[PDB]
């Protein structure tokens, strides 16, 4: 997209600071979830200024890199939508249950995702997207072969590319995939979002099918939640030991989370470091912990 | 599952459908409208999760259509809801 100039990021910081003016209303009573929204934009400003410090000798060469253009354009768009969200919401920002508040927390999740992506691509303010390490080789082979040194791609190229290895049945499904694989919500798949996805749904050989069972037709799957929201969900089935869910954490991308209820009535969690998600799910089915997904008696087969 | 789906504004060709926001979050809503008993592949479009209302234009006047609505979280398709309207 558009070439990067320093004045526009001056504008951008004014917007982030203005969103900070909006959100710092205590009447919102924001919880540090996270995503806190408030804390992420100071860290975004700070890390961006770190990139600038690193690129003081060659500002123009940084402005002609695709990733910085796409990322900045998207940050300006999302923060403008964050202002116009309060604009539309008006007073209904004072209660969390209201819809504009939910949209605010949605954009908080997004902001957390974008910062995470920027820190992944820019460690110490330096571009290493071209030398980005994809975790599962099979995924790294696919990415080096289909695109190569590319850091970011348009979603259309990724749909047409991934479709050749793992076919996509319909636009109904392709939209659902573009949901997860594009965490930034900017029609651009990066090596960061791709690597997170592949680590989340190993192995590669049945990647798309791994996506289907573990995400689409699964009841226990809860996408992104915080420990507060998880306990709020399982409080309704606390008396029922073995009722479990599994979710994702913004704090940790590309890592799984599993929550389940014990006979004591305490809600204890587990994380699958070893074994993939499905295998660990099966094993917990054999042990006697993962019995009811979301307090539902029918348990899917893996 | 979007709750309490209904059409609230009607023209021969354009319909305003309003469903209530689910308690759970919605990243995006997916809508597929198609001719009742029509072999033609249904038309489809998407809206952001903030909206509770959507408008369809270009529907032929004098047809009963079947409209299906999906809620979408990240890698998640909640169960849909459907309505049929005669224009």
Nearest CA in chain A to B79: A217
Q: Does A216 touch chain B (CB under 8 A)?
A: yes
User: Degrees (nearest 5) of the Cα angle A65, A185, A221?
Assistant: 135
Residues facing residue A245 across a β-bridge: A259
CA distance A212 to chain B (A): 8
Residue B19 CA to residue B12 CA, distance in Å, equals 21
With vertex at residue A278, the alpha carbon angle to CA B80 and CA B69, rounded to the nearest 5 degrees, is 10
Nearest to A176 among B32, B49, B77 (CB): B77
Indicate the helix (H) or strand (E) that contains B84.
strand B81-86
Which residues of chain B are within 8 Å of residue A85 when distances are taken between CB atoms? 50
Residue among B21, B30, B73 whose CB faces A175 most closely: B30
Query: Angle CA(A144)–CA(A170)–CA(A177) in degrees, nearest 5?
Result: 50
Q: Which residue of A has its CA nearest to B78?
A: A216
Give CA–CA dist A23/A104, Å, rounded.
9
Neighbours of A15 (CB within 10 A): 17
* Residue of A132, A255, A258, A161 lying closest to A202 (CA atoms): A255
Q: Which chain A residues are Cβ-neighbours of B44 within 8 angstroms?
A: 171-172
For testing contact with chain B, the best of A85, A170, A172 (most B CBs within 10 A): A172
Tokens of A180: 């997860």
What the block records as the tokens of A163 is 């479709």
Cα gap B59→A87, rounded to integer Å: 33
Number of Cα atoms under 13 Å in the Cβ half of residue A236: 10
Residue A124 region, left (φ>0) first, then alpha (ψ -120 to 50), else beta?
A: left
The strand pair at B53-56 and B15-20 is best described as: antiparallel
What is d(CA A261, CA A172) in angstroms, rounded to the nearest whole number?
Answer: 34
Q: Is A193 annotated as a binding residue?
A: yes
In whole angstroms, what is the distance from residue B12 CA to residue A126 CA?
Answer: 58
- In order of A47, A126, A181, A250, the CA distances from A20 in angstroms are 17, 27, 29, 21
Nearest to B49 by CA among A234, A110, A77: A110
Three-state DSSP at A184 gives: coil
B contact test, residue of A81, A89, A106, A247 with most B CBs within 10 A: A106
Q: Which residue has the tokens 């954009």?
A: A107
Q: Which of B2, B48, B53, B75 to mutate to test the interface with A (most CBs of A within 10 A)?
A: B75
Alpha-helix runs per DSSP H in chain A: 6-23, 40-54, 59-63, 66-89, 99-121, 137-146, 155-165, 171-181, 191-200, 207-211, 227-234, 277-287
Contact criterion met (CB below 8 Å) for A265 and A238: yes
| 3-state SS assignment for residue A241 | coil
Based on the number of CB atoms within 10 Å of its own CB, is A61 exposed (0-12), middle (13-18) or buried (19 or more)?
exposed
For tokens 């900045």, what's the residue?
A72
Q: Which residue pairs, CB below 8 angstroms and at least 24 apart, start in A94-100?
A: A94/A27, A94/A28, A96/A29, A99/B21, A99/B50, A99/B52, A100/B50
**Cα gap A249→A112, rounded to integer Å:** 11
Q: Which residue in the set B30, B50, B76 is minimally distant from A223, CB to CB? A: B76
- Whole-number Å distance between alpha carbons of B32 and B68: 5
Residue length, chain B?
A: 87
Q: Are B72 and A176 in contact (CB under 8 A)?
A: yes
Q: Does residue A128 sit at the B interface (CB-CB below 8 Å)?
A: no
Q: Which residues of A touch B28 (CB under 8 A)?
A: 175, 179
- Give, rounded to a whole angstrom, the gap between the first and last alpha carbons of chain A: 43
* B75–A176 CB contact, under 8 Å: yes
CA distance A186 to chain B (A): 13
Q: Is the peptide bond before A203 cis (omega within 30 degrees of 0)?
A: yes
Tell whether A102 is within 8 A of chain B (Cβ): yes
Written as six digits, the tokens of B5 are 């789906």
- What DSSP string runs through A251-284? SSTT-EEEEEE-TTS-EEEE--SSS-HHHHHHHH
Residue A131 to residue A129: CA distance in whole angstroms: 5
Task: Tell me which residue of A220, A223, A222, A201 sits closest to A212, measured CA to CA.
Answer: A201
* Cα–Cα separations (whole angstroms), residue A15 to A23, A40, A45, A259: 12, 14, 11, 38
What experiment produced this structure?
Answer: X-ray
The rounded distance, in Å, linking the Cα atoms of A142 and A127 is: 22
DSSP state of A153: E
Which domains are seen in chain A, by residue range?
6-129 (1.20.930.20), 130-214 (1.10.238.10), 221-295 (3.30.505.10)
Of A250, A251, A242, the residue nearest A220 (C-alpha): A242
- Residue A184, annotated as binding a ligand: yes
- Report how far residue A173's alpha carbon sits from residue A203's, in angstroms, rounded to the nearest whole number: 20
Of residues A167, A280, B80, the one with CA closest to residue A177: A167
How many residues belong to chain A? 302
Whether the bond into A285 is cis, omega within 30 of 0? no
C-beta neighbour count of B79 within 10 angstroms? 8
Burial of B14-44, coded b for 16+ CB within 10 Å and e otherwise, reads ebebebebbebbbbbbbbbbbeeeeeeeeee
- Give the tokens for residue A157: 């190229």
d(CA A137, CA A269): 29
Sorted by sequence, the CB contacts under 8 Å of residue B61 that are 6+ apart come out as: B12, B13, B87
Helix (H) or strand (E) holding A6: helix A6-23
| A248 contact residues in B (CB cutoff 8 A) | 74
Asked whether residue A259 is marked as a ligand-binding residue, the answer is no
């Amino acid at each position: 997209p558009g070439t990067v100039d320093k004045k526009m990021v001056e504008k951008c910081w004014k917007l982030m600071d203005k969103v900070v003016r909006l959100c710092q209303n205590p009447k919102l009573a924001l919880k540090n979830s996270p995503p806190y929204i408030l804390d992420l934009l100071p860290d975004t400003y700070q890390h961006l200024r770190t990139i600038l410090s690193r690129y003081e000798g060659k500002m123009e060469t940084l402005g002609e890199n695709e990733y910085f253009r796409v990322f900045m354009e998207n940050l300006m768009k999302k923060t403008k939508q964050t202002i116009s969200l309060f604009k539309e919401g008006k007073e209904r920002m004072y209660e969390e249950n209201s819809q504009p508040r939910r949209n605010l927390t949605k954009l908080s999740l997004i902001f957390s995702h974008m910062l995470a992506e920027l820190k992944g691509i820019f460690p110490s303010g330096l571009f290493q997207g071209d030398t980005f390490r994809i975790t599962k080789a099979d995924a790294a082979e696919f990415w080096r072969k289909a695109f190569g040194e590319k850091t970011i791609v348009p979603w259309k190229s990724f749909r047409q590319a991934l479709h050749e290895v793992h076919p996509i049945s319909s636009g109904l499904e392709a939209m659902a995939l573009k949901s997860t694989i594009d965490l930034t919500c900017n029609d651009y798949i990066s090596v960061f979002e791709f690597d997170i996805f592949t680590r989340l749904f190993q192995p590669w050989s049945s990647l798309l099918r791994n996506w289907n069972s573990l995400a689409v037709t699964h009841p226990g799957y809860m996408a992104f939640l915080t420990y507060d929201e998880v306990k709020a969900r399982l409080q309704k089935f606390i008396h029922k030991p073995g009722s479990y869910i599994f979710r994702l954490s913004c704090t940790r991308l590309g890592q799984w989370a599993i929550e389940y209820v014990t006979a004591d009535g305490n809600i204890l969690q587990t994380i699958p470091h070893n074994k993939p998600l499905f295998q660990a799910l099966i094993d917990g089915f054999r042990e006697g912990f993962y019995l009811f997904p979301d307090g539902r008696n029918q348990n899917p087969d893996l | 599952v979007p709750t309490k789906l209904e059409v609230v504004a009607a023209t021969p060709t354009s319909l305003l459908i309003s469903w209530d926001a689910p308690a759970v979050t919605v990243f995006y809503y997916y809508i597929t409208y198609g001719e009742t008993g029509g072999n033609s592949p249904v038309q489809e479009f998407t809206v952001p999760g903030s909206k509770s209302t959507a408008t369809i234009s270009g529907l032929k006047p004098g047809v009963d259509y079947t409209i299906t609505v999906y809620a979408m979280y990240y890698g998640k398709v909640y169960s849909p809801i459907s309505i049929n309207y005669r224009t």
